[PDB]
Amino acid sequence: YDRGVNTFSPEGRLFQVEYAIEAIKLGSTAIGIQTSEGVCLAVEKRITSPLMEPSSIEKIVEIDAHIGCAMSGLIADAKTLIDKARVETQNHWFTYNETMTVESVTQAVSNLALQFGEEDADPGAMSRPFGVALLFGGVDEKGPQLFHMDPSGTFVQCDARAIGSASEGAQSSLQEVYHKSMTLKEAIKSSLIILKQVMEEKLNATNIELATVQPGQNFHMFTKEELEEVIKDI
């Protein structure tokens, strides 16, 4: 239309940024919880047909051996951010022989957001914001850490953050059930409980993804047996 991508509303809102933020509410619900025992990431696969293979719906991604990411919204848009996170990481290791801070990874991914434009831009520059919301979860010198990133490039550490279609109700439930000193098993169970009450379908070990980043241990995607072990309770 007449408006450019880099246009400000009379209220001071970047139009395309707000419109990309509205894209997350159509995405699947993801829930990240940070606890002293580790970071738990959960997401709903939202299977639309029995023929579709659930294993191909990858919405929790290994960023590095100590960092994972859960994406919500336009999953295709999240591929570029994931690739930049996984390339920017191992570049810090290449030059400094150390793993990045989760905050540094989230900041590097955030710098990609808002790097879009129409005129006076590079040929490889993007045309629109990334219509995806990311939940980075990892372990670093500061222990376990969970960061939330949105298409405006605003990344912020969160104790327990829910994004996606059910972000409002899941966030309310997280506020109701989160306390700072709780185990990782309790975090996983609470996240699964919150997911189960917001899914359109019925929760099972196939339509959800669960991952954990614990101190000492590496990023771990939960298998079907491990998922069934915790689902059998609730």
Partner 1 sequence: STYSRQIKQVEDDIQQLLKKINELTGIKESDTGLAPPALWDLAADKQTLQSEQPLQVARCTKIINADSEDPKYIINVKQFAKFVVDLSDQVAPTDIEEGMRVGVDRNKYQIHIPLPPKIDPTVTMMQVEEKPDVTYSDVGGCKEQIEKLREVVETPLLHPERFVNLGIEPPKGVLLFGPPGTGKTLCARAVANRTDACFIRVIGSELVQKYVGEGARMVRELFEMARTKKACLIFFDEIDAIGGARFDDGAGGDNEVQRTMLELINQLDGFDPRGNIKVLMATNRPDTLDPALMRPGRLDRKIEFSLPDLEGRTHIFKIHARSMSVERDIRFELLARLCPNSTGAEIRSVCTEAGMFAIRARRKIATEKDFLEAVNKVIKSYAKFSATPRYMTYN
- Residues within the interface to partner 1 (CB under 8 A): 1, 3, 22, 25-26, 165-166, 168-169, 198, 200
What are the two backbone dihedrals, phi and then psi, of residue 199, each rounded to the nearest 5 degrees? Answer: -70, 145
User: Min. distance of Cβ 169 from partner 1 in angstroms?
Assistant: 7
User: Min. distance of Cβ 83 from partner 1 in angstroms?
Assistant: 28
- Closest to partner 1 by CB, 106 vs 165, is 165
CA-closest candidate to residue 27, choices 72, 92, 62: 72
- Closest to partner 1 by CB, 165 vs 207, is 165
CA 32/CA 106 separation, integer angstroms: 15
- Closest to partner 1 by CB, 3 vs 180, is 3
Write out the two tokens for 196. Answer: 């189960």
- Closest to partner 1 by CB, 22 vs 229, is 22
User: Min. distance of Cβ 117 from partner 1 in angstroms?
Assistant: 20
User: Min. distance of Cβ 45 from partner 1 in angstroms?
Assistant: 16
**Cβ contact 57:168 at 8 Å:** no
CA 52/CA 58 separation, integer angstroms: 13
User: Min. distance of Cβ 168 from partner 1 in angstroms?
Assistant: 5
- Closest to partner 1 by CB, 59 vs 66, is 59
- The beta-strand segments (E) located in the chain are 30-35, 38-44, 60-64, 67-73, 132-140, 143-149, 155-157, 160-163, 208-213, 219-221
